[PDB]
Amino acid sequence: RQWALEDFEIGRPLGKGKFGNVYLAREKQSKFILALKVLFKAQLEKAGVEHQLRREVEIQSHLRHPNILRLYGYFHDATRVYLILEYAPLGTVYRELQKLSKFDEQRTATYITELANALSYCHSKRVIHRDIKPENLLLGSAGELKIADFGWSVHAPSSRRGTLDYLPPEMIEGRMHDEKVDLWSLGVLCYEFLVGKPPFEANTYQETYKRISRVEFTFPDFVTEGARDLISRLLKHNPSQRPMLREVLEHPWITANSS
Ligand SMILES: Nc1ncnc2c1ncn2[C@@H]1O[C@H](COP(=O)(O)OP(=O)(O)O)[C@@H](O)[C@H]1O
Numbered sequence: 001r002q003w004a005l006e007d008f009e010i011g012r013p014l015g016k017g018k019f020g021n022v023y024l025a026r027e028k029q030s031k032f033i034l035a036l037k038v039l040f041k042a043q044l045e046k047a048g049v050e051h052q053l054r055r056e057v058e059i060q061s062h063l064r065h066p067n068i069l070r071l072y073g074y075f076h077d078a079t080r081v082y083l084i085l086e087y088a089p090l091g092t093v094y095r096e097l098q099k100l101s102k103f104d105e106q107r108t109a110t111y112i113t114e115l116a117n118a119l120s121y122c123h124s125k126r127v128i129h130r131d132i133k134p135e136n137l138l139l140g141s142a143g144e145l146k147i148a149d150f151g152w153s154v155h156a157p158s159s160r161r162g163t164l165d166y167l168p169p170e171m172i173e174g175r176m177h178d179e180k181v182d183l184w185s186l187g188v189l190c191y192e193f194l195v196g197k198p199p200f201e202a203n204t205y206q207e208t209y210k211r212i213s214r215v216e217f218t219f220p221d222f223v224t225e226g227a228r229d230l231i232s233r234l235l236k237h238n239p240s241q242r243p244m245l246r247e248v249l250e251h252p253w254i255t256a257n258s259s
């Protein structure tokens with residue numbers, strides 16, 4: 001349970017974070033490969049997010065699902081906080097999308113099924129992820145999707161305040177929100193997986209804000225009827241109008257292309 005930096009051999013950086021970096025690491029005694037998320041105390045204090053960090057730790061450490069990234073523990077020293085995470089060897093869904101440009105209907109529907117199942121488990125504990133995006137979706141050794149970065153995670157309902165690309169209208173506007181925010185994020189993902197870019201993508205935060213607020217998006221011609229139907233059902237301005245995850249999992253386009 002009590003760890004120290006001296007218990008780990010540090011490898012290359014795995015990625016850059018908002019409050020520090022993620023490094024590959026090996027526990028000296030067991031030779032267990034893992035990821036160490038290193039955060040700077042000064043930066044967290046200045047941002048006034050030292051309690052949201054405690055929330056990320058508390059929420060993620062109690063989740064057990066094959067499509068959710070494990071958080072084994074944490075420790076800290078005079079300047080830094082260290083989160084001990086499960087290593088996701090095939091990287092981010094973000095990098096996969098950058099090299100493939102777009103995913104086919106089968107890969108998309110499979111990822112959407114994996115997400116819906118992980119989100120269903122979260123929502124059963126009244127946990128809202130609120131930061132579902134390709135760079136927070138990691139790939140296990142078998143290429144299985146793993147929800148990661150519980151940095152902004154909270155318990156529903158919440159009226160608590162990167163790009164806005166995956167945030168629903170109620171979360172922007174700083175209004176009260178529940179588990180329905182993750183259903184909106186799911187529709188933005190589905191679109192991005194098939195099209196290569198999120199539906200409200202813009203040059204500025206200001207322009208993206210407006211597009212989300214208006215639910216202003218169009219589909220390229222290659223997007224099928226079934227895909228258009230599922231996305232359009234998820235991207236409802238009214239959170240109450242968004243379907244349950246059970247409905248997403250039973251959608252004909254999902255059942256026909258997954259897995
Ligand atoms: N367990 C992990 N295995 C592999 N890469 C990881 C892991 N955790 C994070 N990363 C990489 O580091 C990046 C930043 O990690 P993350 O927890 O998402 O940080 P932040 O809250 O700053 O955005 C990720 O997008 C990813 O590229």
Ligand SMILES: O=C(O)c1cc(-c2ccc(Cl)cc2)c2cc[nH]c2c1
Nearest residue numbers: 041044045050053054057074076081
């Ligand atoms: O004890 C401390 O002295 C302490 C502690 C923390 C801290 C916060 C969250 C977690 Cl999960 C672990 C440690 C932080 C975060 C910023 N300044 C700190 C000081």
Ligand SMILES: O=C(O)[C@@H]1CCCC[C@H]1C(=O)O
Nearest residue numbers: 017018019049052053151152
């Ligand atoms: O883990 C982190 O980098 C942060 C902890 C504090 C809240 C915000 C969070 C994040 O950016 O994901």
Ligand SMILES: [Mg+2]
Nearest residue numbers: 135136148149
């Ligand atoms: Mg992240």
Ligand SMILES: [Mg+2]
Nearest residue numbers: 131149151152
């Ligand atoms: Mg984060």
